Design a protein around this nucleic acid. Structure first.
Ligand SMILES: CC[C@H]1OC(=O)[C@H](C)[C@@H](O[C@H]2C[C@@](C)(OC)[C@@H](O)[C@H](C)O2)[C@H](C)[C@@H](O[C@@H]2O[C@H](C)C[C@H](N(C)C)[C@H]2O)[C@](C)(O)C[C@@H](C)C(=O)[C@H](C)[C@@H](O)[C@]1(C)O
Lengths: 7, 209, 176, 142, 38
RNA sequence: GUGAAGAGGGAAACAACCCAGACCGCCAGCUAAGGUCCCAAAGUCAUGGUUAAGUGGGAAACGAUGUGGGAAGGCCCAGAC
RNA sequence: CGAUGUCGGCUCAUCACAUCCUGGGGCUGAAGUAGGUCCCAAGGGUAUGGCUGUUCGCCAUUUAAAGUGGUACGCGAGCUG
RNA sequence: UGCUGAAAGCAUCUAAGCACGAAACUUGCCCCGAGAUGAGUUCUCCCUGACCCUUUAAGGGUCCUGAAGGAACGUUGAAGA
């Protein structure tokens, strides 16, 4: 693829 | 006109009456002996071919020797051509001294630059150095981007990159001639010519004003 | 046509010497001179010259017409000789003439020294007049043209190298 | 039974001399290319050089038509930075004229390996004589 | 000189000339009337 | 209508356009579209015209003594432009 | 959509020309100094700072000038985040 | 921007012909460069023994010979991964 990104 | 082959002994000042320091490279210029003349008949062009130093007999090969044989031998360091232009010279080891430059004010000078071997960008091309700090991750002297994206989809030719630096030809041009000294074989040109102490040098009167 | 079609007298004393397409003409003064033609047919005999189209060049006539005209000025050239006449205007504007080079002083920071070409020669009634006689009409024009060029007449006080048959503008300035 | 096939080991060839002079470039090339490829024989062999050696004189005096002479383009690329060089027809005739004909037929000879080989049989001399007496080149028009 | 796409005579002294491939206008009285790209 | 579920030739390359519907073999022949100077199979074909622009081989209003053809008209050796 | 890392900066660039400076011109309501505008010109050159994440913009102070655009709004298997 | 100049009795830088004309173009300056397979030129140096076989030809082999030079090794360099 984670979910980390752108978006 | 033509020019000569010398040897960088190199670099010292000479002071003047009214108190000025003239930095000069000291070029030793032993007499150049023409080993061959060339002509539009024996195709091509008008040029002379000199040698200047002295070489160990056991180091001179048969061919090199046989070539020196035509004309006054005493094999020198190497050979060099100068193109001609309505000046003329007969081969019988004509021998050309530093005499040549008594009246010359100019002189160009060409050495073989000191060998840096590598450098990479920054040294080689004065590339800027990335943040030394501020989060930079292993990219301090690296070259950074080297192309665009899909559309060139390649790196263009001649891109400035890391690689061999120096130990190549390079000449300097202009260079006031400070002193000419026959029977000493000296030539003081004002300041700084390429290549290291001891290395071979070619000086010619300057092509530019 | 017309100019092409009109004939052209060769006044007594002139040479003429066609050879294919190369007319040459000597007269009283003048280095003769020699032109080339192309889709023209030049016809001597008589005390005249005559010009007309050559079969198969759609450019004919227009070509002949020029041809006639050129030849003509050669005749008139090498006989009477051709005119000229320039005059300087503006404070400090001298002209000299040493041999075959005009020496002009036109308010520059250096002299000029214009060398006359070949069949043309120059005089200076005053320091502010130049008349140059010559045979070759094409060139005489050119040299005056060159001479005018060193300082084309500006339109506020008319200063600079004039012709004489010129017209020269002149506008009211309008400060500011 | 299979129809014939020229064989490199036994093709004829023979030499010729051609005078470019007034001839119009290209209308010339055509025949050069044709004769260069062998298309006037048992050519009858796409995969074999069956053409004749043929040398061209006075390439500088070659003729063009139209305003071509000052307006024909001739481009090439140095493969570098942005090195799109060009040179007008007259400019070409001025410096190494032989080029004009050379490229003009090179373009009309086929494609690849063989093609390149066919081009070697054409000797294009700027001037008038040619140092090929030994081949005893027989003149031909067109 | 003016460039324009439509050129046309202005004064009674403007003249129109086809030099090179380009159509022009020359006025012997009034410099403002010179024209190209015609 | 075609492609989808259709290969083949043409349109440089290009499912859908043009011509045309491949049961298998043939180193026979005639054609379709499209072509016939060279790459490249076939006209450097015949006759009569036009264009000078590489127009052909990208584009409008509009501009202009480019140039070919046609019908009619005005002024002219009482001298026209 | 069995994954084409998306803003700005940094480093490095590269083309176009609708040219910011330098070069050559026509016209000017061009006296001169200096401008305006159109044409030709892409060879080279084309600012450091304050504020803000900014690009930008405002401001300070320079400069011959501080050009407009394309390049996945160039540049995450180069950095920053 | 011109000169000369008809087509078009004139005018016209242009259709023939001639002259000017810019950091753009081709050169001049510096560097690379004959894999430039279109592989170029010039000077110099070196090798002048015997003999056999077959399908007998840019044919294969035996003894002698081993050059000019090169490379290797060693001591090494303001040359260098
Ligand atoms: C250390 C070791 C781990 O690396 C990191 O964690 C880096 C730093 C992640 O970026 C971190 C940091 C960052 C910024 O990605 C760059 C963040 O956006 C993502 C979500 O996680 C990466 C790359 C993520 O990918 C990215 O995931 C996105 C959904 C799409 C992106 N893609 C379109 C290109 C893709 O590369 C992702 C999913 O972890 C990759 C998958 C295969 C893994 O799970 C593997 C095992 C990773 O854990 C790893 C390599 O072992």
């Amino acid at each position: 693829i984670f979910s980390i990104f752108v978006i | 006109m033509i020019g000569l082959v010398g040897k960088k002994v190199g670099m010292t000042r000479i002071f003047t009456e009214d108190g000025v320091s003239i930095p000069v490279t000291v070029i030793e210029v032993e007499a150049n002996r023409v080993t061959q003349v060339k002509d539009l008949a024996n195709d091509g062009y008008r040029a002379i071919q000199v040698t200047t130093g002295a070489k160990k007999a056991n180091r001179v090969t048969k061919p090199e020797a046989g070539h020196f044989a035509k004309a006054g031998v005493e094999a020198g360091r190497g050979l060099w051509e100068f193109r001609l232009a309505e000046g003329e010279e007969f081969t019988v080891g004509q021998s050309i001294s530093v005499e040549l430059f008594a009246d010359v004010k100019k002189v160009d000078v060409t050495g073989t630059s000191k060998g840096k071997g590598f450098a990479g960008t920054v040294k080689r091309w004065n590339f800027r150095t990335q943040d030394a700090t501020h989060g930079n991750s292993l990219s301090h002297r690296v070259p950074g981007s080297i192309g665009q994206n899909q559309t060139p989809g390649k790196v263009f030719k001649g891109k400035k990159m890391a690689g061999q630096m120096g130990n190549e030809r390079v000449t300097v041009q202009s260079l006031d001639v400070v002193r000419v000294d026959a029977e000493r074989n000296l030539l003081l040109v004002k300041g700084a010519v390429p290549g290291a102490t001891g290395s071979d040098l070619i000086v010619k009167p300057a092509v530019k004003a | 046509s017309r100019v092409a079609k009109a004939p052209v007298v060769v006044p007594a004393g002139v040479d003429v010497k066609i050879n294919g397409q190369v007319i040459t003409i000597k007269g009283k003064n003048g280095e003769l001179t020699r032109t080339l033609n192309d889709a023209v047919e030049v016809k001597h005999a008589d005390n005249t010259l005559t010009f007309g189209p050559r079969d198969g060049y759609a450019d004919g006539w227009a070509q002949a017409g020029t041809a006639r005209a050129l030849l003509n000025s050669m005749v008139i050239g090498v006989t009477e000789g051709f005119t000229k006449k320039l005059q300087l205007v503006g404070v400090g504007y001298r002209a000299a003439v040493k041999g075959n080079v005009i020496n002009l002083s036109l308010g520059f920071s250096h002299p000029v020294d214009h060398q006359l070409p070949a069949g043309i020669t120059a005089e200076c009634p005053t320091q502010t007049e130049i008349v140059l006689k010559g045979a070759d009409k094409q060139v005489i024009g050119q040299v005056a043209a060159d001479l005018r060029a060193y300082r084309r007449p500006e339109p506020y006080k008319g200063k600079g190298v004039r012709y004489a048959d010129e017209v020269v503008r002149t506008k009211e300035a309008k400060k500011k | 039974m299979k129809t014939f096939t020229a064989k490199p080991e036994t093709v004829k060839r023979d030499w010729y001399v051609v005078d470019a002079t007034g001839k119009t470039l290209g209308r010339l090339a055509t025949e050069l290319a044709r004769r260069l490829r062998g298309k006037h024989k048992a050519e009858y062999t796409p995969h074999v050089d069956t053409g004749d050696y043929i040398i061209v004189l006075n390439a500088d005096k070659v003729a063009v038509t139209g305003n071509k002479r000052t307006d024909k383009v001739y481009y090439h690329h140095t493969g570098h930075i942005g090195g799109i060089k060009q040179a007008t027809f007259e400019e070409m005739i001025a410096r190494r004229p032989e080029r004009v004909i050379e490229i003009a037929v090179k373009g009309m000879l086929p494609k690849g390996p063989l093609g390149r080989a066919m081009f070697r049989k054409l000797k294009v001399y700027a001037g008038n004589e040619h140092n090929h007496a030994a081949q005893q080149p027989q003149v031909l028009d067109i | 000189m003016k460039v324009r796409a439509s050129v046309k005579k202005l004064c009674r002294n403007c003249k129109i000339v086809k030099r090179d491939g380009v159509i022009r206008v020359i006025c012997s009285a009034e410099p403002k009337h010179k024209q190209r790209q015609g």
